[PDB]
Every structure is written in C-alpha cells, then in structure tokens.
RNA sequence: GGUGAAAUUCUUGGAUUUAUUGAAGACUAACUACUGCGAAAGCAUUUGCCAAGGACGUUUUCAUUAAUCAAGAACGAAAGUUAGGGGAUCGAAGAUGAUCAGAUACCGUCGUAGUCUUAACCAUAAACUAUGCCGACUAGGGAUCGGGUGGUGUUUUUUUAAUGACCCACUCGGCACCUUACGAGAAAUCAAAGUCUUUGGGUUCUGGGGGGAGUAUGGUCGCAAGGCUGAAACUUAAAGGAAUUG
C-alpha cells in the first residue's frame, strides 16, 4: 500500500474580510516535513470560488472570483485577490443575435504598483415601441462608446487599490458610470465588466493583507 | 542607349560563373556600390569603404553597418527592440 | 500645422537661411524665431541656442533634417537652421506649437 | 474520364514533346 | 439547370465570405453557405432535474443551461437528418418552422 | 458544514472523465475513468461505464472528507467536437445519487477565437 | 584583415594616470565615429555599450559576451552575429543566453557584453564567383585554402586514397575515440545525408 | 489517443486527466445578417497615423470637358518558383495501421514541401450573377444600409429643452427580397433575360454541329511550371439545352 491521504494535514480557507463571511472551505495538501516540505510549496496557489458564496445573494451567480493564497499562519491560508471572470454560461446568455457587441480593454495601474487588465462587454438595447428589430450602432458610436468607456474605466483606477477596487466591483457602480455616461450616445441593456485579469503582482506587502485578513 | 538588357553591372564577369550566381552577385553589389543618405550631414554622400564600413565623403563620419548595405533589416529589428526594451525600464 | 505656418511666413513675411545669415541675425537682434533642423550637429545646434539665449530669441525643433526643413521653407536645398526676421500674416510666433 | 485530367494528361505529353524536341536539335 | 436563385448560400454583392468548419466532419465550408443550427440543450435533463435538487445546495440555485452555435455541411445536415430535402415548391419556403 | 470540491468531469468520445480536486483544483481526489470499469474499447464512453465510474469515484471520495462537489461538465473543445460525451451527463447523476452535494453546476468547455486551422482537410472526413 | 567584421579602436582614459586608453572593440551596427561608448555596471542600455549581462533586461541583443567574467569578449564575436538573452537567476546570479549556433548557454551575470549586433552582416550571402576571390581571402588567414580531396590522394597520404575508382571504401563517419591520423571525414557524426524529414 | 470495429503510438522512465507559469507561430469565434465597403480578386480584435472613395446636401464653380473602347497598360484567390526569415496547427510526397480479392484510395497515427512574412516571379479559377458597359422608358408592396427633409410624436439626460436613440411621412443613392406575368422565353424562369418579323438609343468583346483541340506550328511572355495568340489533315450524325412520363 501507498496510501498519500495519510500524510496530509488538511488545511483551511480564509478570504479577504473585504466580503461577507470566509469559511471558503478546507484545503488538502500534505505533511510538511523535510525533503521539499509544504510550508513554502503551497505559496504558489490560486482558488476559484463564485461571488455568491462570498456575498450570499443569488443575484451574484456569475463573476466567480479567484483568491491567491499568500501566507499559512500554521493551520491556515490566507488569501488575497487574483482574479474576476464571468461563468460560461452567462456569456452565452447576453449574447444574442441582432444586437451589436462592444468590447473594451484597458490595461491600467492603481495607486498600488497594481498591473492588472480590464474588460468591459456592452450589447445594443432596443428602445420601447421600436419597430426596427436589429438595434445595430452607427460603428461611430462603438468607438464613442469604447472611448467613454476607457476614460471611466481609467479614472475609477489610479485611485483605487485592490483593497478599494473589489468595494467598487461588487456593486456594479461601474456598470452605473458606463450607463449613466453612454446613454446618450446609444440605449444599452447589458453593461458588464466580465473580467479582472491580474498581471505584475508588485512587492508582498504584507501590512497590506492584514488590513483585508481581521 | 540600354547598352544590356539585363546583366547590368555583371557585364564584366562575360558569360562564366553561372546566370544565377551572377544575378544574385548583382543584387549584392548594387547595394555595395551605391550611394546612401548620411543621417548627420543628410546628404547622399555614404559609400563603402570596406565591407562593414560605410564612410561619407563630406562631414567625414564613418559608421559601421552590413556588409554590403549600409543598414541590414536585423540590425534594425535589433535596434528597435533595443530602444524598446530602454524606455519600459526607464519608466 | 506647423509647415503651413512656416510656408505662410515665406510669402508674406522675412526670413534668412543658413548658418552664417542666422547668427549674423542673431547677433544684430532683428531675429523673432530660429528654428533647427533634428540632424543639426548638436556643436552647432548648442551654439544657436547660446546666441539665442544672448539675444533673448525663441528657438523651435524641428523634427525633421535639413531636407524636409529646406522643403518646409519651399527650397530645393537642404536648410539646417531658418531665421524669421519678421512675421508674415501667420501666428508663427504667437503660438510656440 | 473527367476534363481536368484530360488536361493533366496533356500537359504531360506536351513536358514529353518539348523534351524529346530539344533533344532532337 | 439553375436549382436556386439563391445559388446554394447567402450571397449577393461579397463575392467572397470566409471559411468555417462542419462540426460533424470539419468539412470547410462558405460562412453564409453553412446550415446553421442553435443547438439549444439544458445543463442537466428533462428528468434527472429532480436527482440533482435533492442533492444541491442553494436550493434551485441558477438552473443553467448550455448555448452554442453549430454549422454543418450540406451532406451532414442531410445524412444527420436535419433540413430533411423539400419538393420544389415547398423548398421557396424560408421559415424556420 | 460542507467540505466542497470540484467535480470537473471531462466527456469527450471513446471516454469519459471523472477528475475530483481540492477546493481549489491542483491537489488530485479519486480520478476514476469509464474506461478502467469496462473493456469493451466501445462502451469506454457510454453511460453505463461513466457511471460505474462516479459510483467507484464516491467510494475513494469517502472516508477523505469531500461531501460536495462544483460541478465542470467539459467537452474536448478548442479545436474539436465540443459537445459533451455520451457518458458525462450521466456522471452527473450517478454521483448525486451515490449521496454526495452538489454546487455551482458549470460548463467549463473551451471555446477559441478561431486559430490553428482544424483537422480534416478543406474536403473534410468521408467514409 | 582577415576578419569579416570591422573594428572600433575607442579610446579611454586611465582611471589612475593621466594618460589616454586605446582599446579596440569590434565595431557594432550602428556605431559611428565620435559615438560616446559607455562601459560598466550603471551604463545606458544603447547600441554599442558594455553592459553586464545581468544589468540587461530580457531579450535584449548582445554581441562580444564574455563566457566568464574577464575574459574580455569570446561569444558572438564574427560579423552579423550576436547573443540573445532570455531570462535570469538572481539568486546565484547566472544568466541563461542563446548562442549564435543556438545552445543555451548559462553565464555568470556578472560577465559583459556589448549591446547589439556585430557589424557587417550578410557577407557571406555573396558568391565568391572565382577560385581568386578565395584566394585573397585566406591569403589574409591562414593556408587552408585550396583542399585537394583525399580520395584524389594515394593510399600512402590519406585514408580515403587509392582504388580503381576514386571512392572512400569504408564508412566515413569516424568515432570520437578513434586516434589522429584516422579521422577524415565525418567525426562522431549522429547523422548524415541531407537534413530534410 | 483514435475508430463502424480495430490495429499502429505512448504509458508505474507516471500517460491521459487537474492547477500555476510562460514561449512560439497562426487566427480573429459567438455578435455576423437574403447587412457594409471595394474595379475585381477581396476585406471582420484594439487604437494611432497617411492618403483615397461612394452617397447625400448645395440658390458653389467649369461648360460638353462624355460613352464604349483595338494597340497599349495597373491590380488580380489558391496552388506553384527563387532567396532569406518564420516554421504552433493543418498538411500534395512518403511511412505505417486497417478493411478489401487486390487499395500504391477513402478511415487512423505520423510526417518533408507548403500553409506565415519580406523582396521578387507567375497571371490562372465554376476569377459565376455562368447575365459587358453607358443611357431612356415600362408594376405593385414591404423590409433594410447610408445621407437628407418635416413632425405642435416617445426616451432618459436636470421632471420637459438642444443634440443622440427610437416612431411616423417623404426623398435620393445602394445590397436585396415578396407577389403578378403585363411583356419575354424552348422551358427552367426573368422588372429584365421587357420596350424584337409592329425587327434600328450608343458602343466593346465573343460564338457558327460534335470531336481532333486549346492540340500541332510560329511568335511572344516566364527561371520553371506554364500563360497569351492559335490551325489543319482526318473523323462523325449527332453532340447538346430545358421540361414531361416511367
Ligand atoms: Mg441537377
Ligand atoms: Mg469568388
Ligand atoms: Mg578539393
Ligand atoms: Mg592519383
Ligand atoms: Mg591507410
Ligand atoms: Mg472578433
Ligand atoms: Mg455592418
Ligand atoms: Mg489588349
Ligand atoms: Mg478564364
Ligand atoms: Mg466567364
Ligand atoms: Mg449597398
Ligand atoms: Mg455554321
Ligand atoms: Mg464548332
């Protein structure tokens, strides 16, 4: 027999306190004795977990969010953010047939040493008593929209640290700037931001998760 | 008058070596014999002294380059991934 | 906007061309604007700039040789360094763009 | 006997007929 | 003699479109030329619904379901039994039901 | 309460795959296969042989401490059939009836922005 | 002469004596006279200067590299040719370069090189034309130049002299281990024929 | 892995499958349409730059400057050729595995050339709408793209103004469609393929039964493959088009 169950310890899961509560779950690894123990292996870890088990809302069903583990502090992990995307499924949802698709991606930095890029998926709205059936754009409008897009998607970064960044992700007050900035130019009805992609992670900085870990 | 049609500067190899080798010797040695734009002075002053070595004949600046150009098309992808690579660590 | 700006000065105002028409501008003080071609020697380019620092003269880059410097002016010929003498109709000066 | 290689056999016998001609000079 | 006054596709003033590939047998295909299908399936079952309710957390939770946009080729369509060959008259007919 | 994993079941054809993780994907739980269950090389797919292997998936499952799952139902993708093997979809439910949770039910097939040009010929597959 | 590549004699001046340092560098492609040359730790990455190899980000393009630091210059050092640098180990400080015969070499970050690519590139893409144009070039070399074959030879001064006919009669790839006066040919050789798959 | 089923191949030297990180090259999904632009071939991630273009508007300007075109030219999918670079995937040649009487075919696994780029060559496609271009006139309807015009019309922008989005009614230009057969056609069908024995708006190119044969020869273009121009002898009573019935 082999059996590599028995020489694991069966750690658990903490998010950042930037959220509703954090048992996430119980990690399994492995004893960390010599010959290349797990104190330091485990550093190089990313969870992926949905937004609603972190908020508890069912409205939160897309948007799962990645949590890059940091440090253990003995019988622990603890986490900091890596990561927003968009379930498949929700995707294929807003995308239909006869309505345009605007995308927009910025790759900006926040008052932290933050690289980390940014989409943003817009779709065409049909007004109300509209005969035309299409709801296409003028391809003018698609590059003022993707303008006004990455001129508010650059002005809510470079304040904003990931610690503020993920307080302004949840609430969907960007998707209220595009809306409330795009209107004029043309009607919209699924504004999203669909991807936080995390790229040059600057120094650890370790005050910086305590304040996220309670 | 066209005094060739095609030969060119190889009319002096005659009819030996080859019609290949003796087009692709001619596509070298235009290169090598012509005259280029100096970038400091900006006159078309440049001629080859000596394979690598490319002189203008006013403002006497000799600069180093390709063996029978002047500029060789790596060296210039070099120099722009050079340049590329200085303003992101300068930043 | 700036070569239709400097064409308009050619036919409405004064210039000199060169290097030794320049700084003899520079040097009497009936100068506005000098302006230096990008592959000027920079020996010579730090001396218009000391002549024009004496003279309390602007002095505009052009980015471009003293081929395309000579073609803004409407010549034939390379120019290194254009004086303007004295403004035309444009807003050459009034715009250091 | 499909017309495309009617001209593939053609072209064929014709590399034939200019080699054999050039020889024959 | 001339089958369709729409040749086979949906094409009039492109003379050409692009390329796509037959899920069924990567046959390529002109992307106006292909039989296009939204294969529409639910994430589970019509019955095991049910065996997966009782063993779920969040309580019908989203209920999902998969989306994607298929493209046969002509003899797949046929041979999978698909756009099912029409009489001359009723092949005018363009509805989707 | 409940310790969750992640299902991650992989259908292609010719077989199915039934690979448990940790919460978090890199540590390896009960990886059992249609395949290892039956030798018919033509049933490797079926459902029957994906759900002998979720039921011997919830057996080495147990006394490990996993009770739920989140489920990634997967197909070949990038450049291939995409659509889920015969033996997936019953994988999904034979697990669920071996007593085992269930959450977060996901597709997770990849999809490209069309590249590297697929396999059969511009005449495609014809037998 | 003898060197496809041209030279730069850049001169320098004594740290310690008041007097001027005539080095000479082979000359890179873009470097001209009266060109400012920089050598050491904190000098700007810019064609023609002397960096060390971990002073460099990745990618970038070297020539003159030293194998150990002080060797004063051994890899990419013939005319077009120059090292690619791909990536660095801090810790332990080496640095993991391409070759201009494509091995991946690791070497000390501390050793140097000159940024860029050594000039004179393509020279060898011109046919020579004529058994004269060899001739002058390794007049200037060394006399390797013409090579009658060996199986022109007799028995007496080669392996592959003698026969009938002009052939080599046994195989001409050659092992490592065989002694001088034996390998003629194709030594140690893995493979042979025309690379093609 | 792959298959109708297998074999070949890899695998306790850890395959496949799961996670993190990259590299390389190629492509631009879903949105994407009986939609757009372009002379055609063609053209679909993002922004910046440069030059161009159609339409619409005009109570601006010139005043026949035009139409079509031998000769003569520019562009011209893919494949292919030369020399570099690149060479992920796919993949003429070839290897191997099957089935089969045989398979040097289909199916399966590899895999050189190629697929990508630069500088040159080539100049061919069912390059098709198998429908030359310019001009006039002849029938009804909706939908759409772009420009414009008019509404005491809706929509949030601050409660409503402007402008943007949308609705309605017109207009022009465009890709197209639906019905009908006035008329046409051998018919299929066609708003042109109509205004043709009641035959004539201008103009260019091409065909004269089927084969031989796009062959032979000559000339010319190309490195080559080949392109363009292009017969005759002889042979033959059909070949062929559209539709009907079986
Ligand atoms: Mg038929
Ligand atoms: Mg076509
Ligand atoms: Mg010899
Ligand atoms: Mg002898
Ligand atoms: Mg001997
Ligand atoms: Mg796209
Ligand atoms: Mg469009
Ligand atoms: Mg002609
Ligand atoms: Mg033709
Ligand atoms: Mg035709
Ligand atoms: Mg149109
Ligand atoms: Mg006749
Ligand atoms: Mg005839």
């Given at each position: 027999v082999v059996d590599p169950f028995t020489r694991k310890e069966w750690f658990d899961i903490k998010a950042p306190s930037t959220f509703e509560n954090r048992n996430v779950g119980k990690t399994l690894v492995n004893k960390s004795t010599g010959l290349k123990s797990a104190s330091d292996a485990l550093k190089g870890r990313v969870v992926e977990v949905c937004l609603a088990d972190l908020q508890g809302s069912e409205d939160h069903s897309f948007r799962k969010i990645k949590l890059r583990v940091d440090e253990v502090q003995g019988k622990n992990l603890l986490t900091n953010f890596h990561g927003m995307d968009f379930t498949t499924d929700k995707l294929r949802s807003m995308v239909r047939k006869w309505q345009t698709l605007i995308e927009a991606n910025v790759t900006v930095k926040t008052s932290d040493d933050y690289v980390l890029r940014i989409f943003a998926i817009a779709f065409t709205r049909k007004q109300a008593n509209q005969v035309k059936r299409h709801s296409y754009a003028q391809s003018s409008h698609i590059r003022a929209i993707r303008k006004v897009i990455s001129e508010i998607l650059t002005k809510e970064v470079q304040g904003s640290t990931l610690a503020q960044l993920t307080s302004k992700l949840i609430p969907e007050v960007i998707n209220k700037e595009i809306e409330n900035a795009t209107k004029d130019i043309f009607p919209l009805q699924n504004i999203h931001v669909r991807k936080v992609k995390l790229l040059k992670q600057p120094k650890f900085d370790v005050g910086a998760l305590m304040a996220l870990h309670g | 008058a066209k005094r060739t049609k095609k030969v060119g500067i190889t009319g002096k190899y005659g009819v030996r070596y080859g019609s290949s080798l003796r087009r692709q010797v001619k596509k070298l040695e235009i290169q090598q014999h012509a005259r280029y734009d100096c970038?400091?002075?900006?006159?078309?002053t440049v001629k080859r002294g000596a394979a690598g070595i490319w002189t203008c004949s006013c403002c006497k600046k000799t600069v180093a380059g390709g063996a029978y150009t002047v500029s060789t098309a790596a060296a210039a992808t070099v120099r722009s991934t050079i340049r590329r690579l200085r303003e992101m660590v300068e930043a | 906007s700036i070569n239709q700006k400097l064409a308009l000065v050619i036919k409405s105002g004064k210039y000199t061309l060169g290097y030794k028409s320049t700084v003899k501008s520079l040097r009497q003080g009936k100068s506005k604007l000098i302006i230096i071609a990008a592959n000027t020697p920079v020996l010579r380019k730090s001396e218009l700039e000391y002549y024009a620092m004496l003279s309390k003269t602007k002095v505009y880059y052009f980015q471009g040789g003293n081929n395309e410097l000579g073609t803004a002016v409407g010549k034939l010929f390379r120019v290194g360094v254009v004086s303007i003498l004295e403004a035309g109709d444009s807003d050459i000066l009034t715009t250091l763009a | 006997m499909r017309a495309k290689w009617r001209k593939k056999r053609t072209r064929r016998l014709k590399r034939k007929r200019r080699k054999v001609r050039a020889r024959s000079k | 003699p001339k089958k369709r006054a729409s040749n086979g596709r949906n094409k009039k003033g492109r003379g050409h479109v692009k390329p796509v590939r037959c899920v069924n047998c990567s046959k390529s295909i002109p992307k106006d030329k292909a039989i296009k299908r939204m294969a529409i399936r639910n994430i589970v079952e019509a019955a095991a619904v049910r065996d997966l309710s009782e063993a779920?957390?969040?309580?019908?939770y989203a209920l999902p379901k998969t989306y994607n946009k298929l493209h046969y080729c002509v003899s797949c369509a046929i041979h999978a039994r698909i756009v099912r060959v029409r009489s001359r008259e009723d092949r005018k007919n363009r509805a989707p039901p | 309460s409940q310790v969750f994993g992640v299902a991650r079941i992989y259908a292609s054809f010719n077989d199915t795959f039934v690979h448990v993780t940790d919460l978090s994907g890199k540590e390896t739980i009960a990886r059992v296969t249609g395949g290892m269950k039956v030798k018919a090389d033509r049933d490797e797919s079926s459902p029957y042989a994906a759900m002998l292997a979720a039921q011997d998936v919830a057996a080495k499952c147990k006394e490990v401490g996993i009770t739920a799952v989140h489920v990634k139902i997967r197909a070949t993708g990038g450049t291939r059939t995409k659509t889920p093997g015969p033996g997936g979809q019953a994988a999904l439910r034979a697990l669920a009836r071996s007593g085992l949770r269930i959450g977060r039910i996901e597709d997770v097939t990849p999809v490209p922005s069309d590249s590297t040009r697929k396999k059969g010929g511009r005449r495609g597959r014809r037998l | 002469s003898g060197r496809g590549a041209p030279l730069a004699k850049v001169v320098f001046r004594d740290p310690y004596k008041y007097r001027l340092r005539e080095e000479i560098f082979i000359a890179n492609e873009g470097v001209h006279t009266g060109q400012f040359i920089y050598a050491g730790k904190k000098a700007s990455l810019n064609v023609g200067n002397v960096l060390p190899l971990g002073s460099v980000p990745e990618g970038t393009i070297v020539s003159?590299?030293?194998?150990?630091?002080?060797?004063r210059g051994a890899l990419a050092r013939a005319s077009g040719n120059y090292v690619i640098i791909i990536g660095?180990?801090?810790?332990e400080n080496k640095t993991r370069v391409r070759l201009p015969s494509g091995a991946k070499k690791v070497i000390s970050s501390d050793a140097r090189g000159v940024i860029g690519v050594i000039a004179?590139?393509?020279?060898?893409?011109?046919?020579?034309?004529?058994?004269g144009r060899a001739f002058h070039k390794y007049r200037l070399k060394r006399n390797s130049w013409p090579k009658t074959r060996g199986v022109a030879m007799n028995p007496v001064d080669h392996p592959h002299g003698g026969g009938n006919h002009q052939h080599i009669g046994k195989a001409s790839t050659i092992s490592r281990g065989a002694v001088s006066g034996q390998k003629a040919g194709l030594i140690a050789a893995r493979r042979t024929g025309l690379l093609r798959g």
């Open positions: - | 970038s400091f002075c900006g006159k078309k | - | - | 779920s957390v969040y309580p019908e | - | 003159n590299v030293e194998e150990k630091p002080g060797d660095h180990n801090p810790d004179g590139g393509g020279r060898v893409d011109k046919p020579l034309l004529k058994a």
